[PDB]
Structure formats: structure tokens, C-alpha cells
Amino acid sequence: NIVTLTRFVMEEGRKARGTGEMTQLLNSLCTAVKAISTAVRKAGIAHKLDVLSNDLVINVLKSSFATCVLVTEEDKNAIIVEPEKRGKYVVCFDPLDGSSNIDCLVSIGTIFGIYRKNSTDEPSEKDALQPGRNLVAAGYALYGSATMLVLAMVNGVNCFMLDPAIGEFILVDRDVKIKKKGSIYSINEGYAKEFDPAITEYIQRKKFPPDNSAPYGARYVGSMVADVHRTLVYGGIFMYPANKKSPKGKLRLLYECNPMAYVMEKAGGLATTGKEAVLDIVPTDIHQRAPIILGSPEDVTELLEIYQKHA
Amino acid sequence: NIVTLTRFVMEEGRKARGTGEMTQLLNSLCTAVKAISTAVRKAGIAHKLDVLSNDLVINVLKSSFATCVLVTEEDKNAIIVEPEKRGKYVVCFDPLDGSSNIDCLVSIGTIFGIYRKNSTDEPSEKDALQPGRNLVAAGYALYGSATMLVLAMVNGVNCFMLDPAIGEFILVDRDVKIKKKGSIYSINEGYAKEFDPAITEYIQRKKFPPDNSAPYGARYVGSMVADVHRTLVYGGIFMYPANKKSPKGKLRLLYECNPMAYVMEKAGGLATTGKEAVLDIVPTDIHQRAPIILGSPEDVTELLEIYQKHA
Amino acid sequence: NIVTLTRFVMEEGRKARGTGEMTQLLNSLCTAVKAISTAVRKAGIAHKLDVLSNDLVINVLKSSFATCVLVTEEDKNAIIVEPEKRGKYVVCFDPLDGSSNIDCLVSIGTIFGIYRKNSTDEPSEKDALQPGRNLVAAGYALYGSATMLVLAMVNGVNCFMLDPAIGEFILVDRDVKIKKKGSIYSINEGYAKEFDPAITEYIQRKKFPPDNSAPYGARYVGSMVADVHRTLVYGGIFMYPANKKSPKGKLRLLYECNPMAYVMEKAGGLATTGKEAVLDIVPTDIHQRAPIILGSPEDVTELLEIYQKHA
Amino acid sequence: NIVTLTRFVMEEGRKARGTGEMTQLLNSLCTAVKAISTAVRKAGIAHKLDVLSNDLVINVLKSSFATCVLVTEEDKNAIIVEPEKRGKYVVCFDPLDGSSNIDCLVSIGTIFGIYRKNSTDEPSEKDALQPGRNLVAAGYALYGSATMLVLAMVNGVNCFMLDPAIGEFILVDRDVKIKKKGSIYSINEGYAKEFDPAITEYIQRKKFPPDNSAPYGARYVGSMVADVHRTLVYGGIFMYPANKKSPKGKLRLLYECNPMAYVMEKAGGLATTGKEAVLDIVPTDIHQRAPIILGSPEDVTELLEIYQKHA
Ligand SMILES: O=C(O)CCc1c(C(=O)O)[nH]c2cc(Cl)cc(Cl)c12
Ligand SMILES: O=C(O)CCc1c(C(=O)O)[nH]c2cc(Cl)cc(Cl)c12
Ligand SMILES: O=C(O)CCc1c(C(=O)O)[nH]c2cc(Cl)cc(Cl)c12
Ligand SMILES: O=C(O)CCc1c(C(=O)O)[nH]c2cc(Cl)cc(Cl)c12
Ligand SMILES: O=P(O)(O)OC[C@H]1O[C@](O)(CO)[C@@H](O)[C@@H]1O
Ligand SMILES: O=P(O)(O)OC[C@H]1O[C@](O)(CO)[C@@H](O)[C@@H]1O
Ligand SMILES: O=P(O)(O)OC[C@H]1O[C@](O)(CO)[C@@H](O)[C@@H]1O
Ligand SMILES: O=P(O)(O)OC[C@H]1O[C@](O)(CO)[C@@H](O)[C@@H]1O
Ligand SMILES: [Mn+2]
Ligand SMILES: [Mn+2]
Ligand SMILES: [Mn+2]
Ligand SMILES: [Mn+2]
Ligand SMILES: [Mn+2]
Ligand SMILES: [Mn+2]
Ligand SMILES: [Mn+2]
């Protein structure tokens, strides 16, 4: 099948009585996603991807007539869109996430978060410094064995799979919700020596259950998009906390943490730094970093009560 | 590029003065691999994959006229090929590996190992009970953001990437070699409570280097073909040792362990149980399990040395 | 590349200050075109096309929220769109033209013509009975060795080629214009015995030039879309006049003749029945037939002066 | 379906007790055909085709180790294959036929005929100067709304359609036979002034049946592979006789006429100059031209009888 992404976003646009700008925005982004997907599929045949990916996303978004401020992980500064092409939305994105693993055939992905412009002064970088709680839509595309587009908005999370015979995204999972409790923990344990006592304690309880509990299985792809998507569909928890390398975490607030935290929350899951909901952090820099812990609410909660006890 | 998989195996057949049977076998397999790839890419759009995958591999292999005995993970007993279609090769395969992960859009794969039939009596299940050291060829296809086919034989290991525009696998890396030393370890730490003392000590050295040498990074996708591929291309070590639930290990010797062990050894790596080369084990059952440790020669050796000390 | 059809129609929408309905309409139609294109490409692999084609076009157009009255060559009656999905445009189309030749691998095509609704009473079949001169846009998709979408509007004719790696139409020829004079005539000469004296005379002058003129070459694919597209890009003339079989011609006014006549005229060519401009005919039946003669203005004019002389 | 082209030629090689050389030759050719297909499908998106096509065919053929002498329409002299790569087959081909029509999105194609080298002296251009009757195999690929590969050999003619999802040609019609009598004639009537008297009389009988039998319908795409394919599948007759500009005809004997004549005869049709079987002509030059008349046995015979009467 019935539903294409195009059909779905238009029907949501009309149900919310929008102008249609969102529908242009998402239709454009879908074009860049398809192109990134085919380029990653033929990467080794060539004759940088993240530079081609960045330009694809930038151009299609500029030409959607739906945006005014763009933040890319690949650009030092926020891009302020030409007046002629200006629309009302602010888009934060990571055009090609996990690209230290394109070489290892690793599910990589594009991550985005969309805001309605704040003020009415000339659009500026400050318009992208909004808490994640003001997101109107967010999601990611996962370039894997299939190309999948996960989109979250006020009414929930929907999963769309790229049909390569026609170049359209087909709705395959409506209203996704994560399990309340999972049996998988995901973290890079090579940082063991730098982990705080809370994380250290939780990791230990996962592995040495106070007996007779089966231990959780461990998974860590090393690409956020793959690890978050597994967490969404099969449940459990994902962690990239602060360590010594970065005592503010590694992952980026605006276009890595917020978008995943917004999907998680709309699926019925949680997302926190250990001390506050990721979505209520107010950024001060467009490239700011945040620690993140996200996943099924029972597991996330368990970890947050370890944080509380140690405090 | 220059070289299609079709051209490469023909060239290799002639250099080896073969009958061409191995060539029809590899070309047939290739058709099954392209078909699996496409079905995984549009799996959510459907309207089991490992049943369809099993059938694809069985069919193209029977019809290649190159094979007499087939062992699949999905079948209780070996399939004996009808006389009219028999050729001389014994093929052991895992048609769709990592299928607990298709749901989480995760690199899954096809694993195969090819034997020359042993005897001259009627072909039977016993013809597949050969040590890995007698392999003529082995490899895997990895269904990821790109489709890769890795093929190892006496002259080395070669990597081919699927060009979806023409349905041909293109040679993208000739004579692949693993790095002598890596910096990544891969294992499900979820089983820590059941790990033997040597694995326990090696893991702790990887996270708390004695030395003020940087800790190894951790990765574990949970699909063998993804984990072995990353090990092959970036180096380090992959481990699936025996634990409690599996005192003989989890992974299958004939169609998971041997192929990967063969690929590794041809790439200049190592592959051991902790006590003997996986490729010298003589299976006693077609679905036998074996513990396995494989990867860069320095990392694996280092582990072997700990086993030695604890003995 | 620079320009996608999607980019192009939106930029035309904004230059004409439209509501965006046209852009939804054309984006939807583009989806059905891609699907028809892949289904015709794999037709023989199956496991009727014009029934699948008709439903594709109908559904995507209904769901565009841009249409109120649909006329298909495959439906007896005009389809009046549900109030909820109603938009202002009336679409006439031939979903799969030339389908007595899918069997012969013949370039077949989809043909459409779009009108703005006339009245304000409830939308009805009468809203599709407009002269071709009221068209706001028209064109065709040609399923050939490449899939091409030719779109004509007030500022001209543009040609877009389907990029199968990303499922987008890329602008490859802007502002197409036909040659003033061609050297090819296209007609089914098997109807010789039924042709009027005007057509008979013109055919004879093409073949037996009053000497020293090179004769025109003859071409007739038997699929309007292929024959018109050749006429557009290389010039010359195309004829499907009245005969005895149908003394009103064979081709359909609303969704075969008008659309081709509108493209021709916007390319700088002509289109007539022999007695009046096709575009000024006012239909009386949605399935009405018209004789048509179209192509480079010098050739069309020559034929029309043969008609005048015989009158 | 059951049968891929790869499987079918292997099966046929074994039944014929071949060396496998013809099998590598056909598989190689197949790769060139898939590549040409894709480049024609995205030709307008570029950023000459017959130069690229020439190079594709030459390269895959040289690298098949199956060939010693190559005749292409695009090369002055025969290409003699380097000793290391030589095999026993002589291949005559038209890499991209109908290329005056790519511009008008029109079915174009690859035509090939394969000979066994004659002598034992050094391979040379003379090895290609064999009557069509010595063909071992011939056919064509037709790049249209679908890509088809038609392959004829001693056991008959077979049609394969390209499945773009897996890059394999699938057997869709086994043992193809032309109808004994058709109802379509195909010829460029643009040359009527230069036609011999027998062709003139046959054309007039087709349009004004003596009999009150329905006139034949006319078709002429202007690309031989398209016209011969329609003739093969629906019946009737295709004609390219000598005229003034070409007193020996236009079409090329070795790589246009012979292959089509071979396909036709294997399908139970006929192929003549008007005076002898095209397949019994002995070429005197690699780029020799021949007049040709081919198609259903009743239609062709009927024409032959008129030639007889006028003699
Ligand atoms: O915040 C808004 O009002 C825009 C949200 C929106 C619109 C719209 O306002 O037009 N249309 C949509 C379609 C999808 Cl799928 C998702 C969202 Cl959030 C939307
Ligand atoms: O020893 C033999 O019988 C052949 C080995 C072989 C053949 C063949 O006989 O056709 N084809 C091959 C392709 C590759 Cl990649 C590797 C080998 Cl050993 C081969
Ligand atoms: O007749 C009209 O006003 C609609 C024409 C139109 C619009 C619009 O009004 O919004 N947008 C377009 C885009 C393209 Cl490509 C072509 C046309 Cl006719 C159009
Ligand atoms: O006579 C021969 O040498 C073989 C004929 C042949 C071969 C082969 O030798 O490999 N392969 C074929 C494929 C087809 Cl479709 C037809 C023929 Cl005759 C063949
Ligand atoms: O190697 P590390 O430090 O575990 O980091 C891996 C993480 O970094 C990234 O590669 C880059 O953001 C993420 O996709 C992933 O979650
Ligand atoms: O969940 P576990 O015990 O870590 O098992 C993972 C292993 O199981 C499999 O999915 C199937 O054998 C392998 O691909 C993978 O390496
Ligand atoms: O066979 P005829 O009578 O020449 O008609 C062919 C014409 O009919 C159609 O097949 C059907 O509309 C057209 O595509 C084409 O122009
Ligand atoms: O224009 P003409 O003389 O009818 O020539 C058409 C012929 O020329 C070619 O395009 C090239 O030989 C053939 O495919 C076709 O049959
Ligand atoms: Mn990035
Ligand atoms: Mn990133
Ligand atoms: Mn399996
Ligand atoms: Mn398995
Ligand atoms: Mn029709
Ligand atoms: Mn029609
Ligand atoms: Mn040519």
C-alpha cells in the first residue's frame, strides 16, 4: 505494499494541516538518501563519500524550499540558506555516520533532526541551538543489507524500506515501539579502564547475574545507526557514556544524540546522559558532545538508578 | 574494472588445468548469491529467507553438474546428488548466516567450503567428513551496505564486490592479506561468567594493557561473516570459544569454522581451537561444533601462549 | 546532472505561483511511471500489464490530492475522485499505449494530458470534455532502451531520463524544438487502399520526388509514443488519418491525440486532422477518436496544402 | 524461473561434449551485453556508445580465451587475438546496431555470429570469410523496454530476458519457431523508386490483395534487430533488398545478415537474397554487403516465386 513514504508524509501533512513544506523537505531528503545508498553500494567500484554525502544532503535540502538553517557534522559553521530558497525548518544532520567502517562493509547511516525556526530575525546558527524536545521530526536512514528509513514525529515511529526496483520507500512497520525490557547491552568495553563506577557496576551485573538470571548478550557494531536500530527492533540498551577521551562523551548532541533520543522516546523508550533526559539539554555549540544511554525503559531505568545510588 | 568473478575463475581454472567443473560450480553459486542479495534487500517488502536461501543454493549447485554431496546447515542429512547431475565436488554451506539479525538490518552472509570427493564408492555423507586442510576453495558472501564475495583458494584470497547495474562481481582487492597485528578484539562478553581462564586473562590484557599501550577497541556484530570480514580487512581477533551452553563451542565446523579458518590461513592469519589448528580437526558429524579463535597472527599467537601457560 | 524532475517542476511551480497541487500530481505520476517501467522490463519473468498500469496510474493520482476527474483509456466512464482526495485537475491518460507490442519488445508508453477543472458544480465527465488548447501540461513516458519522460507546459518541452540507480528522472534536454523540416514520413501504408486522395498524393511525392530530390525515409514502429518521439527528436511527419476501419481515425482525442498535439505545438511543430488544428477540437465523448497529422511545420503544411487543393 | 543463460549453455556444452570454450565465450559475451544494456539505459545521463560498445565486446571476447579472430563492424580489419589468449572461435559482430536511433529511444541491439576456425595456419582475416552455413551459433541482444538475448545453435533458437535484479538472463521461450505465414511486411518504402520489379509487385499485392483477403499491416522500426525480432515472434517478412544507393544491399553479410539468417532458419523461417540462401553466400570481404529477405516460409517463398517469374 500500500504505502510509499511520499504517500505517508502527505497524508500526515494534511492531517496536521501543514503548508506542505515538510513534505517537500522529506521528499528531497529521500532523494539524497537513495543516492547515498547506491553510492555506498558501489563504493569499491568508484573508478570521499562523506563529502559527496554532505553535498547531496545540502543541495537537495537547499532546493526543497523548506529550510533556512542547516547544520552538518561535516561543516564548521551552520549554513544559512539563500533568501530565495528559504523555508521555515532548521535541519541538523549527520550525512554519513559510521564512515570509519565503509571499508568493513558496515551498516552506516544518515541521521537527521528537524526543527521549526525559533525567532523571526535573520535565520542564524542560534536557530539550531534548540533542545531536542522541540523536534518536529527525526530519524535516520540505515545503509545495510537493505536500505531502511526510520522516521519519528508526534504520532510515532515508522520504518520504510527502499524498493530498489522503483526508487521508493515502502512503509513496512507502522507505529514501532521498543520492548519494555531487552536482553542485549551494547557498549565499547575497550574503554573499561576509563568508565565511571556506575557504568562499571551495570556492566558487571549484566555479565555475572546474581544467579540464575541468564546474562544479557553483548553486541556493538561500532556504527551508531546500526546499534540504535538493533536496539529499537529487538530491545535492550545502547551506551556511549563519558570516558577520559571525552568527558562530555563522543557522540554529537545536535545530529547524533537528539535524533536517536527523539526516535527512542517516540518508540516508548528512554534516552539520558546518566543525569538528565538528552532531549532537555539546551546546546551551546552546534558541534557539542553529549554522553548517551538509550533503549528499553526497564534497562535504561536500571542504569539510572545505579547512577542515583552512586551519587 | 578489468576483472569479473566469471573471468577470474576461468583464468584460475585454466592455470590449474582443471576440467571446468569448479568453474561451473563457482558461476552457479554466484547466481544464488546474487539472488539471495536481492531478496535480503527487499525482505521487508515481501508482500522464511533461510528456507528460500537454502533452496537457491541447493538448486544452483545441483544444476551445476559439479557436485555429488551437499551439506547445508538447514538439512539434517547430507544431500546426495542424483547420478545424472553429479560431478566431483563436496560442498558444505551455510546459506544464510546471522539470520537472527535480518530483523535488525544487519550484515548476514553465505558461507561455503568446497571439497574434492574422497573415495570412489557411492557418494555419501562421509565424503563431507574431511579435515578443512583438504579444502579446494572456500569463502563467503556478505550481504551489507554493499554485497561482497570473498573467495580463497591455493593462491590466496580475493574480494569481489557486486555491481548491481550488471549483476557481476568485480575484483576489488587481489591477494588480500590480514595485518600481522590488530587492535580490535571481538567476542560476546555476555558469556564472561562461563569463559575459561585463558580467555578471561586475554580480555583483561586487552582492556588494561600492562604497558600503557593503548587498549584494543571492542567490536562484535553478532553475525560471523560480518565479524570475520572486519577482522580480515582491519585486523585483530575474533573469538567464539566454548562456554557452558556450548562446551564444544557454538559455531559449526564444516560450514562456519572451516571456511573462515581457510580464508584466514590463506590471508596469512591463524585459526585455532585454543589447542589445535581448526583446519586439522577431523569432523565426526556433519553438524559438529568447534570453538574458534582467528585473526592476526600476532594477536592469535598471544592468546595461544596464554592457553599454554594455563595448561 | 543538476536537475531532477522533482526539482524542475517545483521550480516551475514557484515561478508560476502555484499551490503545489501540480507538483504533487506530477510527483505521483512519476511513481507510477517508474513502477510501469520496471514491470515492463521484467514482463516475461512475471512468474495483464495494462490493467496493472491502469491501477497504478489511478491510485497514485487519487492519492496525489491533486485531481477530481480521471479519464483512462481502460475505463468506460470517467472516474470522479472521492471528495476527501479531490484537487482541481482533470487528467486524461492512456496508461499503457502500444500494448499489442509488449510481446515484440516494442517501445510502449504512457500518455497524459492535464486540465484545470472547468466549472464549480460537482466534478463530472463533462469536466474532461475540454479542447486541447486548455491543457496546462501534457507529455508521455516512453518505456524503451531507456525510460524517458517528455513533459510540455506553457514554457516548452523538456525531456527527462529515468536514472535506474536512484529512481529519479534527470533533465537531459531542456526546451526541445522540432526541426522545421524533416526527411522521414511515418504512416501505416498497409491501409493504402483505404487512404483518401490527399494522403495518397503526399505519400507518392515522398517516394517519387520530382527528381533530384532525395526521397524521405519511411519509419513506422506501430506504437504512437515511439513514433511521435522519433518525430520530435529527428523531425518529419507522423500520420494516422481516417480510413475505412475508422472514418474518424483510430487514435483517441483526449489521451492520445491532444497530448501529442500539445507537445508538438510547444516544440514548434503542428498537429491537425487535415481540416483543423487537433487542439481546437471540442470533444463530445471521452473516448472519441480523431484523425491526426503532426510533425515539422514544413512537412505538415505541405500535406495540409494537398488537402486544400483537393477540397 | 528455472533456467539462467549460464545454466543453459553449460547444459548444452556437456550434451555436445565440448571443451567448454564456447561456454566461456557465451558467458563473456553476456557480461558485455549486460554492460551495454545499462549504458544505453543511462546514455542521456552520461555526464560514443558504439565505441564503448565495441571495446566492451572486444575485451570480454579476448579475455574469454575462446577466440582467435574478431570481426567488428567498427574495425577496418579483423582483430587477430594475442597467442596467449587465443582459443578456436571466430566471432563476427555488430556491437551496437541501429545507432542512428539511440537518439530516438529506439530498440537497438548487438548482433553476433560464431565460427569454428577453419585452417591451422596462423589465424587471420580469411578465417572469417566462411559461408553462414558454417555457423556454430549466432544471435542478438535487443536493448528495448526489456533486454532480450536470442540465441540460435544446432538444436534451435532460444530467447532469454535480462532480470536486472540479479544480472542474469532467464530462459523465457525455448525452441522458438516462426509462424509459417505472417500478416506484416517490413521494408523502407522510402526507396520505392529504386526497387526492382519483383519487390514492387509483392508490395502492391500486400496492400491490394487480389482476393479480398485483408491487406498485410506495415511495420519498419529502422533498426534490424527490432524488425527481425518482431518478425521472429509475430511472423511475416523483413526486407532490405538492393536499391540504387546500395546495389549490393545495405546490411552487412558477416555480422548483420548471416546471424539473422541463421536465427531465422533455425526457427523454421527462410532467408534469401532473392536469388540464393543468404547462408550459402561466401563472403569475399569482411565488410561485404548483401540484400536480404527473411521471415515466415510462406511469405518469403511467395516473394521468391515473383522473382522467379520476372527472371
Ligand atoms: O510541525 C509541523 O506543523 C510540521 C509537521 C508535519 C507536517 C506539516 O505541518 O505540514 N507534515 C508532516 C508529515 C510528516 Cl510524515 C511528519 C510531520 Cl512531523 C509533518
Ligand atoms: O584442479 C582442478 O580440477 C580445477 C581447479 C579449478 C577450476 C576448474 O577445474 O575448473 N576452476 C577454478 C576456479 C578457481 Cl577460482 C580456483 C580453482 Cl582451483 C579452480
Ligand atoms: O495552471 C497552473 O497554474 C498550474 C501550472 C503549474 C504549476 C502551478 O500552478 O503550481 N506548477 C507547475 C510545474 C510544472 Cl513542471 C508545470 C506546470 Cl504546467 C506547473
Ligand atoms: O563442439 C563443441 O566444441 C562445444 C559446443 C558448445 C559448447 C562448449 O564446447 O563448451 N558450449 C555450448 C553452448 C551452447 Cl548454447 C551451444 C553449444 Cl554448441 C556449445
Ligand atoms: O570506536 P568507538 O569509540 O566505540 O565509537 C564508535 C561510535 O563512533 C561512531 O563511529 C562515529 O560517530 C558512531 O557511529 C559509533 O557509535
Ligand atoms: O549470540 P551469540 O552466542 O554471540 O552467537 C553469535 C553467532 O551466532 C550466529 O549468528 C549464527 O551462528 C553467528 O553468525 C554469530 O557469530
Ligand atoms: O496497427 P495500426 O493500425 O497501424 O495502429 C498502430 C497504432 O495503434 C496503437 O497501437 C494503439 O493506439 C498506437 O500506439 C499506434 O500508433
Ligand atoms: O534507413 P535505412 O536504409 O532503412 O536503413 C535501416 C537499417 O540500417 C541500420 O540501422 C544499420 O544497418 C539497420 O539496423 C537497419 O535495418
Ligand atoms: Mn559523519
Ligand atoms: Mn557521526
Ligand atoms: Mn544459517
Ligand atoms: Mn549459521
Ligand atoms: Mn492503452
Ligand atoms: Mn492507446
Ligand atoms: Mn553498428
Ligand SMILES: [Mn+2]
Ligand atoms: Mn550495424
